Structure formats: structure tokens, C-alpha cells
């Protein structure tokens, strides 16, 4: 679908409602509490969701480039051309970029469907491609973009975004971009839908100072000490000046929300039988989200430089991280546009302001709970909350909750709104989400406990329950990963639902957090440990022990495919005691390569996307040891992922990726 019109209020017009939409979002909440609470039997729903950036090749000037001329492709698809989408059981939505595209299948999911998730993501890109060949030719009738030509790949990251020649606008410096006020991102970069740069700008002034990221730099023998990418400009005070300041020897800079939200991600939700097995799932999956990123790492490369770490994570994080220097426990880097270190926070509320440990971009903080493994000790971090919105929570008319979901609430709710439509204000709470769905949907974190809306009422059978979106995943390049990866955390979640009375998955929340940051390191999948339960059919017990991904995916007692992918499969008779029977299944062949794909990259035998990527810029023969990603190598790079993508092993480049077996396998066995 298309996103909704509206005249977006810009932060010092919206910051005087914060309260309001607090209160009458948290009122909503309990309508759809009130509504929906008792639903139960709800089916296993699920369906993925990938972004894509469209990327223009200039064959002849070996440059490639983000192609941010082409995003009438969302509006023509929702449009005229829906009726293919519909018939193709695809949808297609607008994300934070300008290049980039979202496609989810149209309908969910119903349990295991086999091969239909690889073709209903192929059905996506077929599709985008088909609307990007008809542009192609009429572009050639006019005379426009000649030498271009347009691909859709799913990349993580782009590796050059915001060096020169990125974009396919000639001379974007030739105006100034005065939502991010970046030294680096035009804000052609944005999506044209008004809500992605009032978000942009929202976040800065309220911030007082732009997003910050810097990023550990990888350290190869002649790499420069500074970022020598940062220059001194004139045109935004005090933005031009926070740069030498905010920088760091040994960390390429970024100082704008594309940096973060435009880096694509495949994420994947899942429907619960009700909201406590809803909240069961949340909580078992919490600790698999360091574990999936870290595993599916695609991200080495960050603005024209090697990265020293393989993931997006922290860039996304910092890239909408609204927080004054009050609420980061610092000083303004310049205290006298930053006044007090308040930023845009209005005067008469600085009183209220808490120190908060993180961005509103970040890993879970709060288990839910309510399930009888929990014991509220495991939530043992520093988690801030919102003490009026716990108090309504828990005493209210309406949808009394216990004190550990209210806590959950409360945490989100000690964030402002910061993308607001004047239209919106007020709104009719028994029947609008629309408030409480501004915080909550602003609150972007490693998996997500998502509310039905007051129209789902039980009897509504097929109304959309109580669900939980993972989203750690990074996006890699082909079709067949894509849905090896859905497939996989799909098993999971079966698993753990179908054998919840003995699963406990609980661990301390510190050691998830300490997870967190291990699953940035350069090669962490390779070598790296992380806290993992011991055992998980257990009661009582929270053991950890440090285990390597490769532990972590096969030991026999606490390992993912022992104990969470064989068991579902046994049990819904695909195998009888392996796994690794699926090789021999007439009906589950793809199956057993999606597996194996899994096991040999937990395993080190096959690369990470991030791993492919890095060996390829420092082996190119363009590269000058220092760290640097030249538009040649970039190009070369994408031409490569071009050539991955559409399964192309003319330069062995398959084989060398995905390994001999698996390549000569997807190369002679489409999805069916
Ligand atoms: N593109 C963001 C996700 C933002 C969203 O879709 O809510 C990511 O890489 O995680
Ligand atoms: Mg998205």
C-alpha cells in the first residue's frame, strides 16, 4: 500500500502535543486490550518483508550508483498496476529511501509452505524488474538515462552512500538539503512521502545536534588516522561545526538518518494462538536476535570505507537516535546552539527529562513475561520508564494489566512523538490505533510485540492477532538465502510454540545486551562467543555458558538445530531422527539446502555476505590498502551482486560464494 496524505507538524509546532498523544495512544491501547484481550486459536499467520535499493548502473563510467529517479515504481504499483501485484500475491510499500523499495507477500502465510516464500519474493523482484525494463525503454523514447541501467538488489548497506558520484542526480550540491543538514546525504536520499523528512528534521532539532555514528574503522597498513572524508562547510550552524567535534580518530563519521534507515533488513512476523502465547514467543526469541544478526552479517562496509565490524546495527541505531545530550548524560557539543544540553526539548517539560541508557532504536529492554519460566530478576538492566503511563496501565476501567506487560508500555512511552499530522489529533480511541501507533511504531527494536486493533474482536476470525515481528535480520542478496532465513526463524517459532510447556529460554537481559555488541565484531560469526542458555528444558534454570555460533547452531543439548529445527521436523514428519534426511526427501530437497546453507555458514565453511563482500574489496586489484572503496571497486562489487543475484556462475562467482554443491543446486532447481 501506499502511505496515507497529511500536513505533517515540524517539531517545535508538534512538541506541544507529546502529552496528548501519550495519553489518548495509551487509551487506545486499552481499548484494543478491552477488544481483543480474549482472542484465542488464532493460526500461525506469518510473512516476511524485504527492502530492496534500486542501483544504476553506468557500465560505462564503471560507477554505480543509489537510482533516485525512479521511485514513481511505489505509486504505480499501488495504482494502475496493483492488479498485477494482487494477482501475483505480492505487495509493495515506501521505506525511509528514495531508492529503496519494500515487498511483502499480499496474503500471510499459513504455516509451512514450503518453497512458496522463495517464490513469492522472486514474484516481488520479477515484478520490480519488469516495471524497471518498461522504464528503460521509455526513458530510451525520451532520450533519459542513457548508459543506465537499473537493477533492484538486496543490500544491507550501500558501500559508497554519501561519497562523490553516489547518486544519479549530476549536481545535488548545487542547493543545500536543509532536512538532514548533512556534509554527506542530499536529501534526494529521502522518499518524497512528507512523513520520511519531517522525521529526519523532528529528530535533529529535537536532538539539537545531527545523529552521530561512528563507526570503528578497519585499520589495513596505509589507512589514514582521521576520516579524511569530513570537511568544514558554511551553510547550517550549528550543524557545519559539529563535525570536528563529534568525529574520532579511527572512525569513519556519519551524521545523517540515511545512513541507517536507508541500510535494508529482511524482517519476519509471526502470529501467536493468543496474547499469552504471544508474549511466551516474544521473550524465547529475545536472546536469538544477537545470535541472527551476528549469523546473517552483510554490512562491512560503511560510506566509502572497510569497516572494523560486519553488521548494521549500531548505525541504524545512532541514525534515529532522538536523544539530547541531556538524556545521553553529556555535554552539547556546542552549548551555545545547545542550550543546556536540552536540545529542542520545550522549557516548561525539561523537569521531566530522564537519563535514558539507550536509543529508541535498540535491542528488546523487558522481557513481558506472564509465562511460568519468567522471574522478574532476569530483567536486570537499567530500563527508565514512563511512571504515569505504568500507573494508568495497571489501574484503569478498562484493561487492567499485570505490572510486568505495563512495564513493557511504560518503557516505549518515555519517548516523544516525532512524526505527527495535524489531521490527526484527535481521534475516536475506541475505534483509532493511530496514536498509540505512533509511539509504538517508534519504538524500533530486535523484535516487536504487536497489538491487534480494536476491530479485532474474537470472532473475527481472520483479523490480524496478537503477533511478534523479529527483526535482526540483515538482507543478503539472493532469493534463496532470503528464504532460508524465513524459513528458519518459521521453524523456530513453530518449535518454540509448539513445544512451549517445555522450553525455557529465559537468560539474564545484561547478557543479551553484552550479545548485542559481540554480534557487531568483524568476523564474530567466525571465531566470536556469545551467553547461551545451557539447557532449555529446564525448569528454574538460567545457566549460561559462552558458545560459538557454530555451538550455538549444533551442540546436541543446546544447539538450534538440535533442539529447535529437528524437533519441529521430526515432529511434523518430515524426518524421523535428522535433519540432514531431508537430502534424500523427494518433497523436501529445497528444505535440506536451506538447512545446510544455515549449518555451513554457522559453521564457517561458507562466507557471511560480509565476509564475500570484504575478501572481494581488499583482493581487487584497485585497492590501495587503506581502507578505501573507490567508485571502480563499488562497481566491480555490485556488478558482482548483479551477477549473484541472478544466479550467473559465468565467473564462478556463485560457486566461489555459495560453494560448489549449493550453487550447482540453485542454479538447477528453481523453487516450486
Ligand atoms: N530498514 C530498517 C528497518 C526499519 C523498519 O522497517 O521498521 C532495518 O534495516 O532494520
Ligand atoms: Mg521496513
Given at each position: 500500500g501506499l502511505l496515507a496524505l497529511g500536513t505533517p507538524l515540524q517539531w517545535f509546532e508538534s512538541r506541544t502535543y507529546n502529552e496528548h498523544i501519550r495519553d489518548e495512544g495509551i487509551?487506545?491501547?486499552?481499548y484494543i486490550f478491552q477488544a481483543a484481550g480474549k482472542r484465542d486459536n488464532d493460526?500461525?499467520?506469518?510473512?516476511?518483508?524485504?527492502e530492496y535499493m534500486v542501483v544504476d548502473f553506468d557500465d560505462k563510467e564503471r560507477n554505480s550508483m543509489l537510482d533516485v529517479c525512479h521511485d514513481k515504481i511505489l505509486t504505480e504499483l499501488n495504482m494502475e498496476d496493483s492488479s498485477l501485484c494482487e494477482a501475483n500475491d505480492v505487495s509493495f510499500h515506501p521505506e525511509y529511501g528514495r531508492y529503496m523499495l519494500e515487498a511483502t507477500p499480499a496474503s500471510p502465510y499459513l504455516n509451512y509452505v514450503g518453497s512458496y516464500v522463495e517464490v513469492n519474493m522472486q514474484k516481488r523482484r520479477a515484478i520490480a524488474e519488469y516495471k524497471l525494463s518498461e522504464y528503460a525503454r521509455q526513458d530510451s523514447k525520451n532520450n533519459l538515462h542513457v548508459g543506465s541501467r537499473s537493477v533492484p538488489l538486496t543490500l544491507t548497506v550501500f558501500p559508497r552512500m554519501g561519497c562523490p558520484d553516489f547518486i544519479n542526480i549530476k549536481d545535488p550540491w548545487n542547493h543545500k538539503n536543509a532536512a538532514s543538514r548533512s556534509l554527506f546525504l542530499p536529501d534526494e536520499v529521502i522518499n518524497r512521502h512528507v512523513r520520511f523528512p519531517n522525521l529526519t528534521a523532528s529528530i535533529r532539532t529535537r536532538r539539537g545536534e545531527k545523529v552521530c555514528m561512528n563507526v570503528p574503522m578497519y585499520k589495513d597498513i596505509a589507512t589514514p588516522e582521521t576520516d579524511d572524508s569530513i570537511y568544514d562547510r558554511d551553510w547550517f550552524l550549528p550543524e557545519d561545526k559539529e563535525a570536528k567535534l563529534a568525529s574520532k580518530p579511527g572512525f569513519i563519521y556519519m551524521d545523517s538518518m540515511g545512513f541507517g534507515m536507508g541500510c535494508s533488513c529482511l524482517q519476519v512476523t509471526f502470529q501467536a494462538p493468543n496474547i499469552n502465547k504471544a508474549r511466551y514467543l516474544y521473550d524465547a526469541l529475545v536472546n536469538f536476535a544477537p545470535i541472527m544478526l551476528a549469523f546473517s552479517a552483510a554490512a562491512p562496509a560503511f560510506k566509502g570505507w572497510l569497516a572494523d565490524q560486519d553488521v548494521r546495527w549500531n548505525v541504524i541505531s545512532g541514525a534515529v537516535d532522538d536523544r539530547t545530550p541531556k538524556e545521553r548524560g553529556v555535554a552539547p557539543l556546542l552549548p551555545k546552539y545547545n542550550k543546556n544540553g536540552?536540545?529542542?526539548?520545550?522549557?516548561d517539560v525539561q523537569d521531566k527529562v530522564l537519563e535514558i541508557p539507550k536509543s529508541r532504536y535498540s535491542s528488546v529492554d523487558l522481557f513481558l513475561g506472564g509465562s511460568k519460566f519468567f522471574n522478574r530478576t532476569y530483567n536486570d538492566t537499567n530500563?527508565?520508564?514512563?511512571?504515569?503511563?505504568?500507573?494508568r496501565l495497571l489501574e484503569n476501567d478498562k484493561a487492567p494489566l499485570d505490572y510486568d506487560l505495563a512495564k513493557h508500555f511504560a518503557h516505549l512511552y518515555i519517548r516523544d512523538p516525532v512524526s505527527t499530522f495535524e489531521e490527526l489529533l484527535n481521534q475516536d480511541n475506541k475505534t483509532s490505533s493511530n496514536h498509540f501507533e505512533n509511539i509504538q511504531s517508534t519504538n524500533w527494536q530486535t523484535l516487536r510485540f504487536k497489538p491487534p486493533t480494536q476491530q479485532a474482536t474474537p470472532d473475527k476470525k481472520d483479523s490480524p492477532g496478537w503477533?511478534?515481528?523479529?527483526?535482526?535480520?540483515?538482507?543478503?542478496?539472493?532469493?534463496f538465502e532470503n528464504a532460508a532465513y524465513?524459513?528458519?526463524?518459521?521453524?523456530?517459532?513453530?518449535?518454540?510454540?509448539?513445544?512451549?510447556?517445555?522450553?525455557?529460554?529465559?537468560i539474564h537481559m545484561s547478557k543479551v545486551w553484552e550479545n548485542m555488541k559481540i554480534a557487531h565484531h568483524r568476523?564474530?560469526?567466525?571465531?566470536?562467543?556469545?551467553?547461551?542458555?545451557?539447557?532449555?528444558?529446564?525448569?528454574?534454570?538460567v545457566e549460561t555458558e559462552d558458545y560459538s555460533i557454530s555451538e550455538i547452531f549444533h551442540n546436541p543439548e543446546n544447539g538450534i538445530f538440535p533442539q529447535f529445527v529437528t524437533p519441529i521436523l521430526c515432529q511434523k514428519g518430515f524426518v524421523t531422527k535428522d535433519w540432514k534426511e531431508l537430502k534424500h526427501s523427494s518433497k523436501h530437497e529445497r528444505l535440506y539446502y536451506y538447512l545446510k546453507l544455515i549449518s555451513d555458514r554457522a559453521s564457517g565453511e561458507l562466507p557471511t555476505t560480509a565476509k564475500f563482500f570484504r575478501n572481494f574489496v581488499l583482493q581487487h586489484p584497485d585497492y590501495k590498502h587503506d581502507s578505501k572503496i573507490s567508485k571502480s571497486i563499488n562497481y566491480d562489487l555490485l556488478s558482482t551482486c548483479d551477477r549473484l543475484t541472478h544466479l550467473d556462475d559465468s565467473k564462478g562467482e556463485l560457486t566461489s560464494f555459495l560453494g560448489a554443491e549449493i550453487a550447482e543446486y540453485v542454479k538447477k532447481n528453481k523453487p516450486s
Amino acid at each position: 500500500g501506499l502511505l496515507a496524505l497529511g500536513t505533517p507538524l515540524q517539531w517545535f509546532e508538534s512538541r506541544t502535543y507529546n502529552e496528548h498523544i501519550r495519553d489518548e495512544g495509551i487509551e487506545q491501547l486499552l481499548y484494543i486490550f478491552q477488544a481483543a484481550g480474549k482472542r484465542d486459536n488464532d493460526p500461525l499467520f506469518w510473512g516476511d518483508e524485504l527492502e530492496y535499493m534500486v542501483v544504476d548502473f553506468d557500465d560505462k563510467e564503471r560507477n554505480s550508483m543509489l537510482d533516485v529517479c525512479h521511485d514513481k515504481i511505489l505509486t504505480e504499483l499501488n495504482m494502475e498496476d496493483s492488479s498485477l501485484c494482487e494477482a501475483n500475491d505480492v505487495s509493495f510499500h515506501p521505506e525511509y529511501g528514495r531508492y529503496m523499495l519494500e515487498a511483502t507477500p499480499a496474503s500471510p502465510y499459513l504455516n509451512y509452505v514450503g518453497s512458496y516464500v522463495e517464490v513469492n519474493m522472486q514474484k516481488r523482484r520479477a515484478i520490480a524488474e519488469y516495471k524497471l525494463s518498461e522504464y528503460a525503454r521509455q526513458d530510451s523514447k525520451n532520450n533519459l538515462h542513457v548508459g543506465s541501467r537499473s537493477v533492484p538488489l538486496t543490500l544491507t548497506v550501500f558501500p559508497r552512500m554519501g561519497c562523490p558520484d553516489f547518486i544519479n542526480i549530476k549536481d545535488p550540491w548545487n542547493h543545500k538539503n536543509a532536512a538532514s543538514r548533512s556534509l554527506f546525504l542530499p536529501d534526494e536520499v529521502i522518499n518524497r512521502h512528507v512523513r520520511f523528512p519531517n522525521l529526519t528534521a523532528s529528530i535533529r532539532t529535537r536532538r539539537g545536534e545531527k545523529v552521530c555514528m561512528n563507526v570503528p574503522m578497519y585499520k589495513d597498513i596505509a589507512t589514514p588516522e582521521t576520516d579524511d572524508s569530513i570537511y568544514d562547510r558554511d551553510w547550517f550552524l550549528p550543524e557545519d561545526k559539529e563535525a570536528k567535534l563529534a568525529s574520532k580518530p579511527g572512525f569513519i563519521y556519519m551524521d545523517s538518518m540515511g545512513f541507517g534507515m536507508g541500510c535494508s533488513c529482511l524482517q519476519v512476523t509471526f502470529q501467536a494462538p493468543n496474547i499469552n502465547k504471544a508474549r511466551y514467543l516474544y521473550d524465547a526469541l529475545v536472546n536469538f536476535a544477537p545470535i541472527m544478526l551476528a549469523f546473517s552479517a552483510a554490512a562491512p562496509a560503511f560510506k566509502g570505507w572497510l569497516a572494523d565490524q560486519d553488521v548494521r546495527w549500531n548505525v541504524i541505531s545512532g541514525a534515529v537516535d532522538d536523544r539530547t545530550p541531556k538524556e545521553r548524560g553529556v555535554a552539547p557539543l556546542l552549548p551555545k546552539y545547545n542550550k543546556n544540553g536540552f536540545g529542542g526539548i520545550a522549557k516548561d517539560v525539561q523537569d521531566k527529562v530522564l537519563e535514558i541508557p539507550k536509543s529508541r532504536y535498540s535491542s528488546v529492554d523487558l522481557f513481558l513475561g506472564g509465562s511460568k519460566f519468567f522471574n522478574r530478576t532476569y530483567n536486570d538492566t537499567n530500563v527508565p520508564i514512563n511512571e504515569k503511563v505504568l500507573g494508568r496501565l495497571l489501574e484503569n476501567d478498562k484493561a487492567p494489566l499485570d505490572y510486568d506487560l505495563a512495564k513493557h508500555f511504560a518503557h516505549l512511552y518515555i519517548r516523544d512523538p516525532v512524526s505527527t499530522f495535524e489531521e490527526l489529533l484527535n481521534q475516536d480511541n475506541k475505534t483509532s490505533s493511530n496514536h498509540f501507533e505512533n509511539i509504538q511504531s517508534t519504538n524500533w527494536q530486535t523484535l516487536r510485540f504487536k497489538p491487534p486493533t480494536q476491530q479485532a474482536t474474537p470472532d473475527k476470525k481472520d483479523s490480524p492477532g496478537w503477533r511478534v515481528e523479529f527483526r535482526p535480520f540483515e538482507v543478503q542478496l539472493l532469493d534463496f538465502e532470503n528464504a532460508a532465513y524465513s524459513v528458519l526463524i518459521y521453524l523456530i517459532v513453530d518449535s518454540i510454540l509448539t513445544f512451549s510447556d517445555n522450553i525455557n529460554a529465559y537468560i539474564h537481559m545484561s547478557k543479551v545486551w553484552e550479545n548485542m555488541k559481540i554480534a557487531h565484531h568483524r568476523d564474530a560469526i567466525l571465531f566470536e562467543k556469545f551467553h547461551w542458555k545451557k539447557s532449555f528444558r529446564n525448569d528454574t534454570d538460567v545457566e549460561t555458558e559462552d558458545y560459538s555460533i557454530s555451538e550455538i547452531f549444533h551442540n546436541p543439548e543446546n544447539g538450534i538445530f538440535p533442539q529447535f529445527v529437528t524437533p519441529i521436523l521430526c515432529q511434523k514428519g518430515f524426518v524421523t531422527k535428522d535433519w540432514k534426511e531431508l537430502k534424500h526427501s523427494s518433497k523436501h530437497e529445497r528444505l535440506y539446502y536451506y538447512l545446510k546453507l544455515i549449518s555451513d555458514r554457522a559453521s564457517g565453511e561458507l562466507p557471511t555476505t560480509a565476509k564475500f563482500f570484504r575478501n572481494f574489496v581488499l583482493q581487487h586489484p584497485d585497492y590501495k590498502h587503506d581502507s578505501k572503496i573507490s567508485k571502480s571497486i563499488n562497481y566491480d562489487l555490485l556488478s558482482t551482486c548483479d551477477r549473484l543475484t541472478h544466479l550467473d556462475d559465468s565467473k564462478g562467482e556463485l560457486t566461489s560464494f555459495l560453494g560448489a554443491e549449493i550453487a550447482e543446486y540453485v542454479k538447477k532447481n528453481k523453487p516450486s
